[PDB]
Amino acid sequence: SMNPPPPETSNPNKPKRQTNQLQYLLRVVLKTLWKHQFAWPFQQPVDAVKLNLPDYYKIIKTPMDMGTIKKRLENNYYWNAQECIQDFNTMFTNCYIYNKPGDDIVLMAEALEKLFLQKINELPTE
Ligand SMILES: CC(=O)c1cc(-c2cc(C(=O)NC3CC3)ccc2C)c2ncccn12
């Protein structure tokens, strides 16, 4: 089996900004989720070869992971916070699409998503 190339984390012709909302997404949101006991399945792209999930990238056509999001934030890849929030939501949604309800990995995603929602509830204005 083969994995696909990972999502891009740098693109010199993509316009970039560093806003206070994006700084919050790195310093508060990403850092809170990254240190969590349940973060580890989400800290890198799914290696469907090593995990013996040959159908993963047949089902998941918009992969996303926190390793990618971390690199994007540290590279100032984004223009606005909504782009980054969409990446997080894609990662959670992919987990719920691929896995069975009640699987341990789904419980892990739900726990991270609850914290995610609590932090973005206080996303600073501007
Ligand atoms: C997000 C998702 O659905 C998901 C993630 C994992 C997962 C991936 C890795 C991994 O790829 N590590 C790379 C370094 C080699 C490791 C451990 C786990 C539990 C998983 N395993 C079974 C079903 C679903 N998943």
mmCIF file of C-alpha atoms and ligand atoms in Angstrom:
data_model
loop_
_atom_site.group_PDB
_atom_site.id
_atom_site.type_symbol
_atom_site.label_atom_id
_atom_site.label_comp_id
_atom_site.label_asym_id
_atom_site.label_seq_id
_atom_site.Cartn_x
_atom_site.Cartn_y
_atom_site.Cartn_z
ATOM 1 C CA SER A 1 0.000 0.000 0.000
ATOM 2 C CA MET A 2 0.949 3.670 -0.304
ATOM 3 C CA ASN A 3 0.164 6.817 1.620
ATOM 4 C CA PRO A 4 -0.674 10.006 -0.255
ATOM 5 C CA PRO A 5 1.575 13.035 -0.045
ATOM 6 C CA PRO A 6 0.775 15.011 3.119
ATOM 7 C CA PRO A 7 -1.192 18.271 3.018
ATOM 8 C CA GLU A 8 0.947 21.223 2.086
ATOM 9 C CA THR A 9 2.377 23.363 4.886
ATOM 10 C CA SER A 10 4.198 25.997 2.837
ATOM 11 C CA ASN A 11 3.301 27.712 -0.409
ATOM 12 C CA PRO A 12 5.308 30.864 -1.148
ATOM 13 C CA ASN A 13 2.664 32.272 -3.479
ATOM 14 C CA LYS A 14 -0.175 31.879 -0.966
ATOM 15 C CA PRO A 15 -0.684 35.239 0.781
ATOM 16 C CA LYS A 16 -0.084 35.011 4.516
ATOM 17 C CA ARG A 17 -0.922 36.951 7.662
ATOM 18 C CA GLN A 18 -0.156 36.801 11.359
ATOM 19 C CA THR A 19 -3.276 38.058 13.163
ATOM 20 C CA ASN A 20 -4.046 38.070 16.860
ATOM 21 C CA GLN A 21 -6.684 35.395 16.230
ATOM 22 C CA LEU A 22 -4.117 33.163 14.516
ATOM 23 C CA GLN A 23 -1.675 33.762 17.369
ATOM 24 C CA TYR A 24 -4.407 32.580 19.760
ATOM 25 C CA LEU A 25 -5.001 29.494 17.632
ATOM 26 C CA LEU A 26 -1.332 28.535 18.071
ATOM 27 C CA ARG A 27 -0.622 29.700 21.638
ATOM 28 C CA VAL A 28 -3.935 28.574 23.206
ATOM 29 C CA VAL A 29 -5.894 26.193 20.968
ATOM 30 C CA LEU A 30 -3.180 24.085 19.319
ATOM 31 C CA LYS A 31 -1.044 23.998 22.466
ATOM 32 C CA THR A 32 -3.976 22.876 24.624
ATOM 33 C CA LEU A 33 -4.904 20.043 22.280
ATOM 34 C CA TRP A 34 -1.296 19.004 21.577
ATOM 35 C CA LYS A 35 -0.471 18.344 25.252
ATOM 36 C CA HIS A 36 -3.653 16.316 25.863
ATOM 37 C CA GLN A 37 -3.403 12.629 26.849
ATOM 38 C CA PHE A 38 -5.456 11.761 23.735
ATOM 39 C CA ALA A 39 -3.517 13.857 21.208
ATOM 40 C CA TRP A 40 -1.139 11.180 19.941
ATOM 41 C CA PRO A 41 -3.295 9.615 17.136
ATOM 42 C CA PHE A 42 -3.804 13.122 15.750
ATOM 43 C CA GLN A 43 -0.257 14.521 15.875
ATOM 44 C CA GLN A 44 0.744 13.333 12.370
ATOM 45 C CA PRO A 45 -0.936 12.251 9.125
ATOM 46 C CA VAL A 46 -2.571 8.847 9.307
ATOM 47 C CA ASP A 47 -0.007 6.257 8.166
ATOM 48 C CA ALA A 48 -2.478 3.883 6.573
ATOM 49 C CA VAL A 49 0.318 1.482 5.635
ATOM 50 C CA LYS A 50 1.677 1.019 9.148
ATOM 51 C CA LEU A 51 -1.827 1.020 10.654
ATOM 52 C CA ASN A 52 -3.053 -1.537 8.066
ATOM 53 C CA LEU A 53 -5.935 0.711 6.947
ATOM 54 C CA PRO A 54 -5.802 0.251 3.168
ATOM 55 C CA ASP A 55 -9.217 1.890 2.723
ATOM 56 C CA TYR A 56 -8.442 5.029 4.780
ATOM 57 C CA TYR A 57 -7.574 7.297 1.852
ATOM 58 C CA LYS A 58 -10.334 5.749 -0.248
ATOM 59 C CA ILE A 59 -12.817 7.119 2.290
ATOM 60 C CA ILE A 60 -10.971 10.230 3.541
ATOM 61 C CA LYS A 61 -10.250 12.573 0.613
ATOM 62 C CA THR A 62 -9.467 15.715 2.683
ATOM 63 C CA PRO A 63 -6.994 14.479 5.318
ATOM 64 C CA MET A 64 -5.942 16.752 8.141
ATOM 65 C CA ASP A 65 -3.938 16.343 11.326
ATOM 66 C CA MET A 66 -2.527 18.494 14.117
ATOM 67 C CA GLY A 67 1.021 17.982 12.921
ATOM 68 C CA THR A 68 -0.003 19.674 9.682
ATOM 69 C CA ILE A 69 -1.908 22.395 11.538
ATOM 70 C CA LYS A 70 1.066 22.986 13.849
ATOM 71 C CA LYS A 71 3.425 23.414 10.882
ATOM 72 C CA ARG A 72 0.919 25.684 9.145
ATOM 73 C CA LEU A 73 0.636 27.908 12.217
ATOM 74 C CA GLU A 74 4.391 28.007 12.846
ATOM 75 C CA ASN A 75 4.926 28.833 9.146
ATOM 76 C CA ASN A 76 2.192 31.523 9.168
ATOM 77 C CA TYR A 77 0.568 29.610 6.295
ATOM 78 C CA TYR A 78 -2.922 31.033 6.866
ATOM 79 C CA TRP A 79 -4.581 34.311 5.916
ATOM 80 C CA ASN A 80 -7.262 34.152 8.599
ATOM 81 C CA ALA A 81 -8.449 32.193 11.593
ATOM 82 C CA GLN A 82 -11.389 30.659 9.739
ATOM 83 C CA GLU A 83 -8.982 28.712 7.501
ATOM 84 C CA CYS A 84 -7.319 27.196 10.560
ATOM 85 C CA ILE A 85 -10.588 26.494 12.372
ATOM 86 C CA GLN A 86 -11.722 24.667 9.229
ATOM 87 C CA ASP A 87 -8.598 22.465 9.375
ATOM 88 C CA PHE A 88 -9.413 21.441 12.966
ATOM 89 C CA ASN A 89 -13.026 20.739 12.032
ATOM 90 C CA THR A 90 -11.877 18.678 9.049
ATOM 91 C CA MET A 91 -9.672 16.557 11.316
ATOM 92 C CA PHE A 92 -12.505 15.873 13.766
ATOM 93 C CA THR A 93 -15.010 15.188 10.972
ATOM 94 C CA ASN A 94 -12.660 12.736 9.226
ATOM 95 C CA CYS A 95 -12.381 10.761 12.450
ATOM 96 C CA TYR A 96 -16.161 10.518 12.779
ATOM 97 C CA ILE A 97 -16.538 9.554 9.104
ATOM 98 C CA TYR A 98 -13.950 6.799 9.124
ATOM 99 C CA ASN A 99 -14.370 5.175 12.531
ATOM 100 C CA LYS A 100 -17.304 3.395 14.145
ATOM 101 C CA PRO A 101 -19.320 5.283 16.780
ATOM 102 C CA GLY A 102 -18.045 4.506 20.255
ATOM 103 C CA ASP A 103 -14.578 3.432 19.105
ATOM 104 C CA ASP A 104 -11.831 4.584 21.440
ATOM 105 C CA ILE A 105 -10.465 6.851 18.688
ATOM 106 C CA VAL A 106 -13.869 8.558 18.453
ATOM 107 C CA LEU A 107 -13.941 9.111 22.224
ATOM 108 C CA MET A 108 -10.471 10.649 21.896
ATOM 109 C CA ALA A 109 -11.606 12.978 19.107
ATOM 110 C CA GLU A 110 -14.710 14.002 21.058
ATOM 111 C CA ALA A 111 -12.561 14.883 24.083
ATOM 112 C CA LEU A 112 -10.234 17.018 21.974
ATOM 113 C CA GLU A 113 -13.167 18.599 20.155
ATOM 114 C CA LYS A 114 -14.816 19.601 23.451
ATOM 115 C CA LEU A 115 -11.658 21.494 24.454
ATOM 116 C CA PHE A 116 -11.366 22.940 20.955
ATOM 117 C CA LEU A 117 -14.908 24.313 21.210
ATOM 118 C CA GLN A 118 -14.261 25.775 24.659
ATOM 119 C CA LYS A 119 -11.154 27.585 23.443
ATOM 120 C CA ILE A 120 -12.568 28.965 20.205
ATOM 121 C CA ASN A 121 -15.609 30.204 22.131
ATOM 122 C CA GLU A 122 -13.205 32.863 23.470
ATOM 123 C CA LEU A 123 -11.423 33.602 20.206
ATOM 124 C CA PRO A 124 -10.434 37.274 20.574
ATOM 125 C CA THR A 125 -12.072 39.848 18.347
ATOM 126 C CA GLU A 126 -10.198 41.307 15.338
HETATM 127 C C1 LIG B 1 -7.378 9.907 12.972
HETATM 128 C C2 LIG B 1 -7.723 8.476 12.852
HETATM 129 O O1 LIG B 1 -8.844 8.159 12.369
HETATM 130 C C3 LIG B 1 -6.814 7.466 13.263
HETATM 131 C C4 LIG B 1 -5.492 7.699 13.681
HETATM 132 C C5 LIG B 1 -4.909 6.483 14.018
HETATM 133 C C6 LIG B 1 -3.577 6.272 14.457
HETATM 134 C C7 LIG B 1 -2.546 6.656 13.558
HETATM 135 C C8 LIG B 1 -1.171 6.511 13.857
HETATM 136 C C9 LIG B 1 -0.163 6.891 12.915
HETATM 137 O O2 LIG B 1 -0.484 6.957 11.694
HETATM 138 N N1 LIG B 1 1.138 7.157 13.250
HETATM 139 C C10 LIG B 1 2.146 7.509 12.299
HETATM 140 C C11 LIG B 1 3.602 7.599 12.772
HETATM 141 C C12 LIG B 1 3.141 6.388 11.949
HETATM 142 C C13 LIG B 1 -0.842 5.918 15.104
HETATM 143 C C14 LIG B 1 -1.852 5.519 15.998
HETATM 144 C C15 LIG B 1 -3.226 5.683 15.702
HETATM 145 C C16 LIG B 1 -4.219 5.230 16.718
HETATM 146 C C17 LIG B 1 -5.896 5.527 13.777
HETATM 147 N N2 LIG B 1 -5.812 4.181 13.946
HETATM 148 C C18 LIG B 1 -6.884 3.396 13.669
HETATM 149 C C19 LIG B 1 -8.086 3.969 13.200
HETATM 150 C C20 LIG B 1 -8.147 5.368 13.038
HETATM 151 N N3 LIG B 1 -7.034 6.121 13.337
#
